[PDB]
Amino acid sequence: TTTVGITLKDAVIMATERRVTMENFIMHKNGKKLFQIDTYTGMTIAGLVGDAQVLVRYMKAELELYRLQRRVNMPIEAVATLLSNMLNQVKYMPYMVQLLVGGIDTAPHVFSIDAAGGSVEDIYASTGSGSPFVYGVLESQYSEKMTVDEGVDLVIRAISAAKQRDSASGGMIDVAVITRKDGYVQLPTDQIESRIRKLGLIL
Amino acid sequence: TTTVGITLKDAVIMATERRVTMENFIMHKNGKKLFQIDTYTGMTIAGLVGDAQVLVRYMKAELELYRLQRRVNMPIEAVATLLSNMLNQVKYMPYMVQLLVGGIDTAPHVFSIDAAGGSVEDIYASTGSGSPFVYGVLESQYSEKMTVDEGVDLVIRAISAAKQRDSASGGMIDVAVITRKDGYVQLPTDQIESRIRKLGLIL
Amino acid sequence: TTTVGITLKDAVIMATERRVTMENFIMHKNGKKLFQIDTYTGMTIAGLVGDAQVLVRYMKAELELYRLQRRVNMPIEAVATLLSNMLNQVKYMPYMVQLLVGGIDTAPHVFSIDAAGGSVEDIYASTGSGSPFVYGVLESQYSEKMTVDEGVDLVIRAISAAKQRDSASGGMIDVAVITRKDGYVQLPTDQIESRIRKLGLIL
Amino acid sequence: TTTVGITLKDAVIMATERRVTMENFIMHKNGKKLFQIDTYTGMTIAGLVGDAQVLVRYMKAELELYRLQRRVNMPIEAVATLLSNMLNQVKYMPYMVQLLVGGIDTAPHVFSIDAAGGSVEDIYASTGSGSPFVYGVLESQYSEKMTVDEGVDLVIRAISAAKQRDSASGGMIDVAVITRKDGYVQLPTDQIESRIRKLGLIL
Amino acid sequence: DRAITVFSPDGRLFQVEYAREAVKKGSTALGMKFANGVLLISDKKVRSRLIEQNSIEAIQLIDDYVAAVTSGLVADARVLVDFARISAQQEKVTYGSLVNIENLVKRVADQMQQYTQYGGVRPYGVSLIFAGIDQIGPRLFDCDPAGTINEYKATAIGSGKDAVVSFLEREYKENLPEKEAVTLGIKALKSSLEEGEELKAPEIASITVGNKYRIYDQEEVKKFL
Amino acid sequence: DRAITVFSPDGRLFQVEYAREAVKKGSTALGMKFANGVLLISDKKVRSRLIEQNSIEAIQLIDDYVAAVTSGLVADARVLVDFARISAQQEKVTYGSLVNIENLVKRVADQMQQYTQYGGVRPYGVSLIFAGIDQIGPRLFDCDPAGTINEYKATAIGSGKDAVVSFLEREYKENLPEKEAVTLGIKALKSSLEEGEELKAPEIASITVGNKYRIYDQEEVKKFL
Amino acid sequence: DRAITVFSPDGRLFQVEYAREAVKKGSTALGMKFANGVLLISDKKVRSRLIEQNSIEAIQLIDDYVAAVTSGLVADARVLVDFARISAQQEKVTYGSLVNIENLVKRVADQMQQYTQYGGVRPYGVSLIFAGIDQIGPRLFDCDPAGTINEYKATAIGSGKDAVVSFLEREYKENLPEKEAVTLGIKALKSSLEEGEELKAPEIASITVGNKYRIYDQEEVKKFL
Amino acid sequence: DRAITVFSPDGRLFQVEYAREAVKKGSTALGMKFANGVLLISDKKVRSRLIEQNSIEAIQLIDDYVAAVTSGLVADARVLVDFARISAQQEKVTYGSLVNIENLVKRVADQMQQYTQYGGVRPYGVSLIFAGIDQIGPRLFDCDPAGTINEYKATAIGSGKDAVVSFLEREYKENLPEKEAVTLGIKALKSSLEEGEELKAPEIASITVGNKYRIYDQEEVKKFL
Amino acid sequence: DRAITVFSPDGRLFQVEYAREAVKKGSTALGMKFANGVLLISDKKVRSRLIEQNSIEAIQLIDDYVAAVTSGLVADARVLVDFARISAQQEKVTYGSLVNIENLVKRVADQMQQYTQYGGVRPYGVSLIFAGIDQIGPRLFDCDPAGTINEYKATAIGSGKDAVVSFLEREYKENLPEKEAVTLGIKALKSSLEEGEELKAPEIASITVGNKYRIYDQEEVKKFL
């Protein structure tokens, strides 16, 4: 369940993969792990599927209610604090989830929330079982002066390097790009395949 | 408790078998595992018999109430989301079930729901103890350009190949075909026997 | 605690035995295991004595209330569904029972209910510790074209063959015959002894 | 999670570090462990991140409410007693935290609170996994006649000696200085780097 | 005083009186013991021809061994008869059998006494008579909008209360075969209800001790009519 | 007396009367049994042209095998019809099927009797008729703001209660084919509602025993009009 | 009678009437369907110059696919609109989408029926109209202080109820492009509210099926004014 | 009618009116926006010399970024201001910051609407104005004993409501430096309260966007006096 | 209006007024600040000789650092003083010390405001003054049957409210040694209560900042008498 999200100068790039497996047996080869919860905000879930989808519905409804009755979008730190309180009220009967929240209000932010409720802002983050391979790739090639195209190439390279050594990850790659000018944009499948072909990878 | 459900161009074919066994001892050689919960929707239960039948009655009553007071049928994704919430509200005192929901609203859908509440749409799905044998047959012979007769032949071939290697499955084969023009149609026993005889199988 | 119930053309024959033992020590050599809960309906309990008798009283009172305030008898599938809901509401603090329901509304039915709430209709059924011996006798001599006298002979033969190999069963044999014309009729002891003498058995 | 806080003549110096790790795997290299909860009061959290941040928000809101409706600041012993009651009401379903409270009302105070609710005032205190190394440095170089600059040098020396032998601590060093004349002042990063360079340390 | 159950200036509960005049406006019904049982005859005046004659029943069963015919407001009658049914079933679950029919009339009478007693609720404007055999034998009761019960050999209820009770007061014989008993009951129902110069076919049930319940059909009552 | 449900000086519940005159001010509707089923015809007087004619429905379904048309206050009508729907679904979950439609009318009638009974709430000012087949067969009921139910072969409700019931009292035949049945029903609806010298296209549904529910469309009713 | 919700001497709920005359004292607003959507125009009469003109909004959104403009007491309006918002969010969490807007108006109407029904609380003195598209298509509703709902093609509310509804009764055309629709709506708002010899710039929103919500700005409405 | 919150014969809530005349008997206070913030000036008429002049404060803080001055009954004022304080702290705990001051005035207004709505409690006889900056900018509100809120650029409250609002209606300029703003406010407070031929030193606070709260001292207000 | 706490025709709470005239019928008491503390002198008019003179105390301690003398109904006085005692002990448990005496008077005033606010209970017909030192210094409060508090340098309560407050209004000096302070207080108590041509030995307590509480004995007060 490899997830990744990096920041740039006025852009957030968040990418996942798609394989649902809870055995040594592959149930589904095409799942959803990257969601849109506001106009300029996304969220990647990784962990237990049911609890993840319930948290997704609860966050989408409450963000939409706040936006309608205040006529402004909710800030990203307020989103992370609200979700931290929601996870930490039930810390003894917990949720088995591990999720990321990224967005743009005046500057790009990425928050990383664990199953007890601790949210820590960092530049780049990665959750899942392929997270050490993703942190190994991003430790040696990430730079703050990169452009949007180089970032899209980097997250594809990182997930495609994590797919080779982790048995629980695989499939096509979702990529979404968040910008203040263009909003939440999810890149098409043929464009992702063109990226993979011009880099020199398989599947 | 072998179940299977595949999609085609504007058709859903769902098939089960019939044997109730919770020991190394066969209680009943004729049970019900394939139900009809709406005009264009079916559901196969597999797991614990009591919890399965309670979920069947709860879904049939609520679908009928919604249909009567709204004068339109409920969409399949709404059915799967409602059943996911019903299973996930009690996730610590759980139900021991594993079920499939298939139907037609504008395009054929098949949803696969586990015991915690995670519903993932896929092209074909199979639950039970003969599910690896069914996924082995359907991995090598399934094609999207198949017709309705070839699909009916394929699910009979898959379940009859799972009946030979799994000790907990056996008996006659229920087959139901869902179409927008004809509605929920369940195929007769003599027609299923004619299929088995013209393919070349036994029992 | 051997119980048996078979169906014929417009008749239901249900037979038990009578020995209460919960040790390697025989408490009582004369108990009650075959009850009448409606005009055309019987029920055999097998399992824990206290929970069994409480379920018997609860079913008799509610069937009588329904009959009085509706002026028609309750159908057998409705009886099995009601008892299934009553057993499955408490499935985590369960009842240790295993019971059969048989009767006549328009066609003879026999339902077999377990301790969690799964009710499956079958032609003949048998619960208890002598149930494999009863299923061994009924597998090789049962026929659908049998008459009422041959059925009464068959259930006596089956229980008398289960009494020889099971240490927890023994005593006299209750036999009750349910018919649409004559109602619930329980056969006399001297007639059962005449059956046993003309077949050639002991005790 | 090395924390330290010492007192001087009319000054309180509190310093932490910044690394979030709950594995043998470093999640984030830049976290927040030093907070401001009143005009002349700080607090360092060390332990479980979620429970720590919830206690921080609960203390900040209640201190601000008291200040607004009484027009005087709350005394430090009252802060420690309130937080002790809040931790000890739930002592069987506890919080996994270990925190320090320091401030100035008429004399500098430092309180040390554990997870059950016992608050003991002492001259200098240190919580975390590098606390024995910090207590080893402060046992041999602390003096009551030290000035504010020598105290700032001492806490930097202590944390930089704890960073070399404890694998769970590292990163940049937060330093905050509380004075009656100047209020809560947090020292800049370039000034901390100048201190480290003039002492002769690395990173 | 005249609007909620409180005391009079002299010892009268005004609402419970007004409930008694509500049950004086009802349909007449009666019952009496005979040699080894008890009967209940309701008048049934099927007014229009669109009413489904035999499906409307005022002699309603509480059990296979207690029955009840009612008079007064028909809605409160139905609710109270259903309460009596579930109370009889409670006693069957708890003790094993309906040993006393007097217990069954006393629990229903306590239920009516409560809403006689408290404010924020009106009394049940309904009166019932209960009949059946128990371990003691044939019993015939009465009930009152206050919860007062009395045991009879022959009683009435309804619009023809007083005229029927006068005829029963004159002409009742204690030990009596079933045929002459239902004949005497029909003569009682006649003498009162023959003021609209018609009676109709009434509804009538009976028990003899040992047997279950037997409500007549349409054809049998006209022989005694 | 005249403001909350307590007894009269002579045996009358004043609020339940005032609810009956509230349901006399409603829109007329009727229904009758025919040879193997039962029909329900509501008058629908679509007053303005801005009303979405076919979307307002007074013949509302409780189930695939019980229907209901109402008269009186329309809000209390909607709330009571929704209670009847969820009660039918309760019986489907518990027992497996809707065996008796008389049970369904009796539970709703008990719900109306409660607010007839207690203070701090006004009675439901609404009247309904229920129709459908069960295991017994075709049934046709009625309901009253007190909770009184009656079983009919042909009944009415609304502003044209008495005139329609007079025509039904004269001209009804018990066993009747569906076409002549809906013709007799429309003549009944005409003779009353032709005092504003117009009828309109009414709304009408039907069942024959064995089949599900069938509400007519706009075109079919005008052939019988 | 005239102080709490009980029945009249003839079938009238006096408090719910007094709520209707409370909503007759409000500010006028209207709405109508057009060819592929529905519009809502409120009059906005910004009385003083200190009122922050565009921040006071009577066209309030319940969702991205249901909107509401209100009339009557403004506090009860705000509370009821917030109840409608959280009910829409409940349906989004439970079923996945807002499939019927008629469900949303019916739940709010049940909420108003409750305080019509019980004592110890006054009725909601407020009237609303709902507008938006669902799976069925464009819908336009109305609400009443009793909880009565009706579906329209064009309706009004407020002080200019009757004059606007008269103009809509004469001059409405069913299928109509958006520009001529908002022109007809403004002429309707004019003919009534031009009795104080002024209209103002009104507030107006619109949807066409497929798209989200679009409230106009200050500049666009004055072109159609 | 005149004793508990129910409807009039014509659309008036009598108790909420009587609360408005209770807040007309209070002490006057006002406030207005200036170029980058908002001020609040209360009249303070320190009547006796035994009152501890500066310790009685009617400009009370809800937070470091919302303040409130009140008028009406002083006890209900204190209770309502404390409710506003704990509601602001609730929003600080839940979301992280006080993003909208309009949320804070709306929750307090809902609290007043509830006791406007229910029986067994009188309405809050108090009126408040709220002022402060949020993410949107400077805001100035008002509150009503019904729970009605309005947004202003300049408003008043108290005994000198109408005279101050007349002067504000004539002489207010929108963008204005702080010194001339507090001068205009004091001239407004003068023109009304100079009917007892005295004003006094009033109490006055201010914010400019970016900074925290600053209440003047005794010496600074007399320079502008 | 005149029987339960609702609004007047013009802005007056009639029951809270009647409580104020109940506290005008009480026994007089007063208190004033001096140079480094505050005193409280109650009149004590020991009427009969059987009353245990010194055991009846109207100057009662809430804590070692807050005291209270009361006036009005004596039973409500005792209950309210006990509530103040346990509230002071609550603050001692929670925070560690009684930091503000203003918090203690405000919580008791909120307790009186609640029964001013709700129906089904009469207001507390009692008035109290509180006195003591806190971290801020010497404070002297007052309380009202509505819950209104005010801070004073010198105040009174009881039957001799107005005459004592007139003498305090003329002759009070702010910074004053303890001996001349209790002399001025006794002259104040004299000038009012010397209308029955007697005063008596009164009861009087004092604190100077830093020390605990000291109630005088019988012998010391007669030197200043």
From Swiss-Prot, chains A, B, C, D:
Its EC number is 3.4.25.1. It is found in: Cytoplasm. GO terms for molecular function: endopeptidase activity; threonine-type endopeptidase activity. One of its GO terms (biological process) is proteasomal protein catabolic process. The keyword Protease applies. Changing T1S: No effect on catalytic activity. The active site is at T1 (nucleophile). One of its GO terms (cellular component) is cytoplasm. The 20S proteasome core is composed of 14 alpha and 14 beta subunits that assemble into four stacked heptameric rings, resulting in a barrel-shaped structure. The two inner rings, each composed of seven catalytic beta subunits, are sandwiched by two outer rings, each composed of seven alpha subunits. The catalytic chamber with the active sites is on the inside of the barrel. Has a gated structure, the ends of the cylinder being occluded by the N-termini of the alpha-subunits. Is capped at one or both ends by the proteasome regulatory ATPase, PAN. Belongs to the peptidase T1B family. The configuration of the closed gate contains an opening large enough to allow rapid entry of tetrapeptides but able to impede the entry of proteins and longer peptides. NCBIfam families: arc_protsome_B. This is Proteasome subunit beta.
Curated annotation (Swiss-Prot), chains E, F, G, H, I:
Changing L73 to A/E/G: Prevents PAN to stimulate gate opening. The N-terminus is blocked. The formation of the proteasomal ATPase PAN-20S proteasome complex, via the docking of the C-termini of PAN into the intersubunit pockets in the alpha-rings, triggers opening of the gate for substrate entry. Interconversion between the open-gate and close-gate conformations leads to a dynamic regulation of the 20S proteasome proteolysis activity. Pfam families: Proteasome (PF00227), Proteasome_A_N (PF10584). It is found in: Cytoplasm. It comes from the Archaea. The keyword Iron-sulfur does not apply. GO terms for cellular component: cytoplasm; proteasome core complex, alpha-subunit complex. Belongs to the peptidase T1A family. The 20S proteasome core is composed of 14 alpha and 14 beta subunits that assemble into four stacked heptameric rings, resulting in a barrel-shaped structure. The two inner rings, each composed of seven catalytic beta subunits, are sandwiched by two outer rings, each composed of seven alpha subunits. The catalytic chamber with the active sites is on the inside of the barrel. Has a gated structure, the ends of the cylinder being occluded by the N-termini of the alpha-subunits. Is capped at one or both ends by the proteasome regulatory ATPase, PAN. Component of the proteasome core, a large protease complex with broad specificity involved in protein degradation. The T.acidophilum proteasome is able to cleave oligopeptides after Tyr, Leu, Phe, and to a lesser extent after Glu and Arg. Thus, displays chymotrypsin-like activity and low level of caspase-like and trypsin-like activities. This is Proteasome subunit alpha. The gene is psmA.
